[PDB]
Amino acid sequence: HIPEGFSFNNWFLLSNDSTLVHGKVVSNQPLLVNCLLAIPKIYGLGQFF
């Protein structure tokens, strides 16, 4: 689970068309995380996923 206390400034809802200006909704979204990499160096060597 994602920890609480995040502004989520660089995050947006996954929408095919249009966007909800304000409100609430429940849907399946890509939120569960297995691993996180930050301040990276290795992808400059042709990293493969």
Binding site: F12, P30, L32, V33, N34, C35, P40, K41, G46, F49
Partner: protein
């Protein structure tokens, strides 16, 4: 492959590039074992923050889902990540998102 009005070969693909040099004109090269064609889709937006790619071929930019493709299996990433470039690295975080 994206270039700022510097297209030694993409200019042949798109003779009337238009606009000016400041905006970046991006292209998708359809490389395969039969042809190496270059396609133009859109011009670089001034600001890009979050980019999402799905396993089913759907790409999402700024929560739009600009393009959709077929089945995907792997990907390769390269830039100037020469150890000391992480300070001005263009990637903040990369994660394995799940539905």
């Amino acid at each position: 492959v994206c270039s700022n009005s510097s297209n030694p070969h993409l200019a042949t693909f798109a003779i009337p590039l238009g606009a000016t040099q400041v905006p970046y004109y991006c292209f998708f090269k359809v490389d395969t074992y039969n042809s190496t064609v270059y396609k133009f889709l859109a011009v670089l937006p001034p600001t890009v923050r979050e980019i999402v790619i799905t396993k089913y071929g759907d790409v999402y930019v700024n929560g739009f889902g600009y393009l959709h493709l077929g089945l995907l299996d792997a990907v390769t990433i390269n830039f100037t990540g020469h150890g000391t470039d992480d300070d001005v690295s263009g990637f903040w975080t990369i994660a394995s998102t799940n539905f």
